[PDB]
């Protein structure tokens, strides 16, 4: 049938999608800036579609409730037909690939440790062998699921602590986790994807850092509903953008050219 405007679901996560200063009271795609905003414009150009950027209503990446079996987050928006594509830092995982389609990855990353500068922690193993410094992850995402599912001794030990810690060590958004590190006087460390860790390390007040290697290796992909005819073109477009060096240009633009430290 006739061309239709593609509904894009995404999430407010710096530096992927951010509200431009003084654009809050305005309308349309032009309100937003970031790596994924630029990436959306390129995918749409190469695939030949018009699009509307929307922020996921529940502010979540996507997980399946064990009770209701209902998917939430951006994943849920695709699964239930509320959006046509997700262009966001959405991690490719087995349980998600069973219900939605993903392009080849547009960025690599791994889970990493964020600390307030001077915290006496260098590794996951260090966190796991002590009790003075609390630590946690984002809720409703792949990082939490990594720990929940791990059979690796250090990570299993970490999960056993995290799952029963009071008050909750989990946070609703990256920003909350970062604020909690900064206000903790060193007594909270945040487990998050290396991409966001590395970005925050380059922002004022320049009081956090990434420590240790990554805990795993994975990627973000552009997601479409299962069997969507958009998937083929989107996938080829990601591969073209990588080979043209466009994805590398965008990474430098939004991480390191914007550096404040």
Q: Which residues are annotated as a binding site for L-glutamate?
A: 89, 91, 96, 142-143, 193
151 binds, among Zn ion, its own copies, ligand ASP, none (CB under 5 to 8 A by kind): its own copies
Q: Tokens for 230? A: 């958009």
In the complex with its own copies, the residue whose CB is nearer, 57 or 213, is 213
Stretch binding its own copies (CB under 8 A), from 30-38, 100-108, 118-126, 186-194: 100-108
Chain residue whose CB lies nearest Zn ion: 156
Please report where in the chains the tokens 């996938």 appear, as a residue: 235
Cα–Cα distance measured from residue 65 to residue 30, given in angstroms and rounded to the nearest whole number:
34
In the bound state with Zn ion, the residue whose beta carbon lies nearer, of 70 and 239, is 239
Task: Work out how close the CB of 191 gets to Zn ion at its nearest, in angstroms, rounded to a whole number.
Answer: 16
Q: Residue 243 CB, nearest distance to its own copies (Å)?
A: 6
Within 10 A of 44 (CB to CB), how many other CB atoms are there? 19
Q: Measured between alpha carbons, how far is 82 from 84 in angstroms, rounded to an integer?
A: 7
Q: Using the rule CB under 8 A, which residue among 20, 30, 108, 261 binds its own copies?
A: 108
Q: Is 139 helix (H, G, I), strand (E, B) or coil?
A: coil
User: What is the rounded CA–CA span in Å between residue 136 and residue 143?
Assistant: 10
- The residue ranges that bind ligand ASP (CB under 6 A) are 61, 89-91, 138, 141-143, 192-193
Let me know if 176 is exposed, middle or buried by CB neighbors in 10 A (0-12, 13-18, 19+). Answer: middle
Q: Is 151 in the site for its own copies (CB under 8 A)?
A: yes
Task: Decide which of ligand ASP, Zn ion, its own copies, none touches 219; Cβ closer than 5 to 8 Å per partner kind.
Answer: its own copies
Residue 110: which residues within 8 A CB-CB, separation 6 or more? 193, 194, 213, 214, 215, 216, 217, 218
205 upstream amide cis, omega within 30 of 0: yes
Q: How many Cβ atoms are within 10 Å of 32's Cβ, its own excluded?
A: 19
Q: Does 38 bind Zn ion (CB under 5 A)?
A: no
Q: Which does 156 bind (CB under 5 to 8 A by kind): ligand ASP, its own copies, Zn ion, none?
A: Zn ion
Figure out which of the listed residues 30, 65, 248, 257 binds its own copies, where binding follows CB under 8 A: 248
Burial class of residue 17 (count of CB atoms within 10 Å of its CB; 0-12, 13-18, 19+): buried
* Residues that constitute the known binding site: 89, 91, 96, 142-143, 193
Q: Which is nearer to its own copies, 119 or 143 (CB)?
A: 143
Residue-wise DSSP of 89-137? S-B--HHHHTTEEEPSPSEEE-EEEEEETT-S--SHHHHHT-SSSEEE-
Distance CA 127, CA 237 (A): 41
Per-residue x/- marks for its own copies, 169-208, CB under 8 A? ----------------------------------------
State which of residues 216, 228, 233, 255 lies at the interface with its own copies (CB under 8 A): 216
Query: Under the rule (CB under 5 A), what is the footprint of Zn ion?
Result: 42, 156
Query: Under the rule (CB under 8 A), what is the footprint of its own copies?
Result: 92-94, 97-98, 102, 104-105, 108, 146, 149-152, 216-219, 221, 235-236, 239-240, 242-245, 247-248
């Amino acid at each position: 049938g006739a061309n239709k405007t593609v509904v894009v679901t995404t999430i407010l996560e710096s530096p992927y999608v951010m509200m431009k200063k003084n654009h809050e009271m305005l309308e349309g795609n032009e309100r937003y800036e970031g790596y994924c905003v630029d990436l959306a414009a390129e995918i749409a150009k190469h695939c030949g579609f018009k699009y509307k950027l929307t922020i996921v209503g529940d502010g979540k990446y996507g997980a399946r409730d064990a009770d209701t079996k209902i998917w939430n987050g951006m994943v849920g928006e695709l699964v239930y037909g509320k959006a046509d594509i997700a262009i966001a830092p959405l991690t490719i995982t087995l349980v998600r690939e069973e219900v939605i389609d993903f392009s080849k990855p547009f960025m690599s990353l791994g889970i990493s440790i964020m600390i307030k500068k001077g915290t006496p922690i260098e590794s996951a193993e260090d966190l796991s062998k002590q009790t003075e410094i609390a630590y946690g992850t984002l809720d409703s995402g792949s990082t939490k699921e990594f720990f929940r599912r791990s059979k690796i001794a250090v990570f299993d030990k970490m999960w056993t602590y995290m799952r029963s810690a009071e008050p909750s060590v989990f946070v609703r958004t990256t920003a909350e986790g970062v604020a909690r590190v900064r206000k903790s006087k060193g007594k909270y460390a945040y487990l998050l994807e290396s991409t966001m860790n590395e970005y925050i390390e380059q922002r004022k007040p320049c009081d956090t850092m990434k420590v240790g290697g990554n805990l795993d290796s994975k990627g973000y992909g552009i997601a479409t509903p299962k069997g969507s005819s958009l998937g083929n073109a989107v996938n080829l477009a990601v591969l073209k953008l990588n080979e043209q060096g466009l994805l590398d240009k965008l990474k430098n633009k939004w991480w390191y050219d914007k550096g404040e430290c």
